């Protein structure tokens, strides 16, 4: 249908139904997180709080995943076993990560039903991230005591970060257990995150795919690629803002320093991916908790193999966490080369021209001479355009599927990004 009928239907056909369904599918999780937030303010024994959040986590996992939730429950139990047998070793991170790796690999070799496994990637990913994080924090000395069974269980089944929620440190969960007052900034954060979650859901389902023919008079492979990319980006921002809202509702997600408590849990930064400066910023602002996790527990350990091999190991861990699909594996393998080549080329350029064109904004005290010139702005905007081009080329895979589908989707675009980064790399090596 043309733009006339499209906008004649739009509101009552997509904007209200999608929002009503999005609310009807998360209202119970929100009610449970609010019940936990109100119950953790009564001054209960800590073990009773941990048991209550274990019960709430069971209820939420059952509500979202009817009976397959065992494949999460079991995992948690297994994790605690691996945490109890080596509670004295300094290897806790290594043992827990190897256990998680073997578990996810056996799951992705169809030892579990291929549709039962695909449904619970989001819960198993968070449980695995939390277990490996606790195992490494105990080694590095950032967590003092190995937790008791109820503390570990209440950590893995934290009702705020169990279904959609981001990864949170063990101490960032203990601080949520001890409870903070129900301020008004808390309610403002919850409300703004819920409103932005619904807004991104609406823009992902309705405005996303129908952008260029209807919302723009523009219209074609690249336009379809870009609208698929933005629909994927906003479908991600929906889950990001919803996890932020459901973790700030349950009490977690805050930082306090010198008698000042601020609810500043940010999972995604949409303006750093829609108006990007470089692909490094895109990768690190797509998911901030996951970027911190992957940099702290996979990169800082695999860094012995060299910087590039460590980047490859980090992106392989990211592809394994997110579930091994061929389109996602190809995207996360192209992202390694893209971000590395762009970072090192911008590095050599900012060293040669002495301009502040580094893949991230330079701090106020830097050697670069030309900082706010218009040539620097032109170069930064050219690299932002290259980042948008890479984003479209990579997000064209998520049109709404193994090697054939990805090679087909990327062959229509003439493999443009994989030649652009090759050209950037040979340009890096020429000016070397």
């Amino acid at each position, epitope marked *: 249908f043309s733009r006339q009928e499209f906008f004649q239907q739009l509101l009552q056909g997509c904007l209200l139904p999608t929002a009503q369904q999005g609310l009807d599918q998360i209202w119970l999780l929100l009610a449970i997180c609010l019940a936990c937030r109100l119950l953790w303010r009564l001054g209960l024994p800590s073990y009773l709080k941990h048991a209550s959040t274990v019960a709430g986590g069971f209820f939420s996992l059952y509500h979202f995943f009817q009976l397959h939730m065992v494949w999460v429950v079991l995992l948690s139990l297994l994790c605690y076993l691996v945490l109890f047998l080596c509670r004295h070793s*300094s290897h806790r991170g290594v043992f827990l990560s190897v256990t998680i790796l073997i578990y996810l690999l056996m799951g992705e070799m169809h030892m579990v039903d291929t549709v039962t496994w695909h449904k619970m990637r989001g819960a198993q990913m968070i449980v695995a991230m939390k277990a490996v994080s606790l195992g490494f924090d105990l*080694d590095r000395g950032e967590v003092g005591t190995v937790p008791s069974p109820v503390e570990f269980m209440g950590y893995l089944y934290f009702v705020g970060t169990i279904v959609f929620g981001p990864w949170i440190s063990f101490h960032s969960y203990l601080q949520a257990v*001890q409870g903070r007052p129900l301020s008004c900034r808390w309610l403002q954060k919850v409300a703004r995150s819920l409103a932005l979650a619904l807004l991104c859901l609406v823009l992902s389902t309705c405005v996303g795919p129908y952008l260029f023919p209807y919302f723009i008079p523009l219209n074609a492979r690249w336009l379809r690629a870009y609208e698929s990319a933005v629909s994927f980006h906003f479908s991600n921002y929906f889950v990001g803002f919803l996890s932020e809202a459901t973790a700030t509702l349950a009490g977690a997600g805050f930082t306090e320093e010198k008698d000042h408590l601020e609810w500043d849990l940010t999972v995604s930064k949409p303006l750093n991916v829609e108006l990007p400066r470089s692909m490094v910023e895109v990768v690190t602002s797509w998911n901030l908790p996951m970027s911190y996790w992957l940099n702290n527990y996979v990169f800082k350990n695999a860094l012995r193999l060299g910087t590039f091999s460590a980047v490859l190991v980090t992106y392989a861990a990211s592809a394994l966490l997110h579930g091994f699909s061929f389109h996602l594996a190809a995207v996360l393998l192209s992202l390694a080369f893209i971000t590395y080549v762009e970072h090192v080329l911008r590095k050599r350029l900012a060293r040669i021209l002495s301009a502040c064109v580094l893949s991230k904004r330079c701090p106020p005290d830097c050697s670069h001479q030309h900082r706010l010139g218009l040539g620097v702005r032109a170069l930064n905007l050219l690299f932002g355009a290259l980042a948008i081009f890479h984003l479209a080329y990579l997000g064209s895979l998520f049109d709404v599927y193994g090697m054939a589908y990805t090679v087909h989707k990327w062959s229509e675009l003439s493999w443009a990004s994989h030649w652009v980064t090759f050209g950037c790399w040979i340009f890096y090596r020429l000016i070397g």
Partner: antibody
Amino acid sequence: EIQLQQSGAELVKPGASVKMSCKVSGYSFTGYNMNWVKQSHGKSLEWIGNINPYYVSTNYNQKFTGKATFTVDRSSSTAYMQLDSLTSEDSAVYYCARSYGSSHTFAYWGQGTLVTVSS
Amino acid sequence: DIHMTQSPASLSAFVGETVTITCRTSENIFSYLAWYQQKQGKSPQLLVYNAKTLTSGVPSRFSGSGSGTQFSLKINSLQPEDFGSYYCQHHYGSPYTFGGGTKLEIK
């Protein structure tokens, strides 16, 4: 019998650097963290940091960062700490302390290296 | 940084008496608090951890207690080998901070 044999007393001129050693005996050197503690004359203790001997990742106290650097030698089962740019305030007794394993309480301590910064 | 205040800074008592040391905590450490005893000219020695669990080999007259931000160590039937400095140290998470220290003297 666990024994953390620590180096002898050192006397360093200001602005220089010193290197204490703590040789481990009686357990697997790469099995437990090795915290470092500092105690002035008749004052409280202060946790400088620890080093994980399995993977050599360290964990510093931000009050002691840039001043103390931890290293290990697994062939000799020794843990070294290097203090840089010593001043008159760095004259204290420095202990090495093994973590208890499960918790990070300091179960086995050294005998202390008396560092004296003067003329 | 958590600030572990310890009281009193110095107390005196006879042999066979009963003494109590308190370690108030700036932030909230759940039950993670340890007690070390350092004699004159020696290295400290862990006595209590988890604020109540006596370590292996310590007489049963030392008793830890408390939780939250108010912990205490009680020594009843004071004996000659119980005089020294007592330091409370949280093991909640790095950086680990010790207390000021209570100098127990002979009366």
